[PDB]
Symmetry: C3
Subunit: 116 residues, 3 copies
C-alpha cells in the first residue's frame, strides 16, 4: 500500500494515490463567473490531475459536487453531461454547500482509478 | 483495477465497482414525505443496489448522510438505527446540506465492499 | 475483502478497515469552544483512531472538512497546517455545512491506509 503524493503543498496534495486508487482534492474554480463557466474550469482541472496520476474521466469512480446555490443545478448539469464519458459515468452526489470564497459556485471532489 | 458500472445513465451510474470496492450514487427519496419515511425509502434502495453489486448492509464501509434540515436528526436516526447490521455498523458522518429537490429531506452516500 | 470494525456502537463504528483501507466516522468536537480549539481536538481524535487501526496522519489519503461557518476558515487552517505531515499532506476538501449540534464548528472526515 505505497502512497504517492501529487502537487503537494504545506496544506494539501492535489491528488493522492494508493493501491490503484486516486483521491483528488476538491477542485475549485480558477476561471469563469457563471456556474457553466466555473464547472467547465473545474472539470478541466480534474482532467489534468487525472492525466497526471495515470487516469482519465472514463476511469472516475465517484464524484461529489458541491454547489453554493442549488439554483445552479441545471446549468452545472449541462456542462457535466457533455463532459462525462458515455457508458462510463461515475457514481455521483450533488449537494448545496457554501465554499471557501463567495464567488465560487461549484466545487467537485473526485475519486478515480489508474489504468492497468 | 477493472471497473463495473451498474444502472448507468448519461449523467451517472447508480453504482460503480472496482477491485472489490463499491461506490453508490447519492440515494434520494422516491417515496415518502417525512424524514422517517424518506430515510426508509433511501435505505431500501441502498439494500437493492448493494444486492445487485453482490454486497449487503453488513459490508458497508462508509455512509455520508446529508439532511436538508438538521432538525430531522433524531427522526432519521430512528430509522437508521433499526436498519444497520448489529456489530457491523459502518463509519458515518451526518451534515446539513440542501438537496437537488426541495422536498428531499435526506440523501445517503454509501461506500461498500463485495463479499468474497 | 475482510472487514475490521473499531469502536462499534449501535449507530456507527469510529473506524472500519478493509483491504488496507481505513474509513473513519466524522470526528466532531469533544472539547473546545473556538474553531482553533475544536479543530485541535478533532485532529487529536483522528490521531487516536488512526493509531488504533495501524495508521497515522502521514498515511491519510483524503480529508473532508465541514465547517459550520466558513468565517472560521483561516483559524481552522492554522491548526490543520501545523498538524499535517510535511511532504505527505492528504487530498483535501473544505465546505460549509451545519453539524449535529449548534456549538460544533468543525467536523473532519478521514480516509486512510494501514502501514506496511
Amino acid at each position: 500500500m505505497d502512497i504517492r503524493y501529487f502537487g503537494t503543498t504545506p496544506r494539501y496534495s492535489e491528488a493522492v494515490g494508493a493501491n490503484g486508487l486516486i483521491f483528488l482534492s476538491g477542485m475549485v474554480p480558477e476561471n469563469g463567473e457563471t456556474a457553466a463557466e466555473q464547472t467547465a474550469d473545474v472539470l478541466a482541472q480534474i482532467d489534468r490531475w487525472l492525466a497526471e496520476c495515470g487516469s482519465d474521466k472514463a476511469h472516475v469512480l465517484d464524484a461529489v459536487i458541491y454547489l453554493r446555490d442549488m439554483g445552479d443545478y441545471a446549468e452545472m448539469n449541462g456542462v457535466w453531461d457533455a463532459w462525462v464519458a458515455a457508458g462510463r459515468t461515475p457514481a455521483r452526489a450533488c449537494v448545496e454547500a457554501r465554499l471557501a470564497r463567495p464567488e465560487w459556485r461549484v466545487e467537485i471532489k473526485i475519486t478515480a482509478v489508474k489504468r492497468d
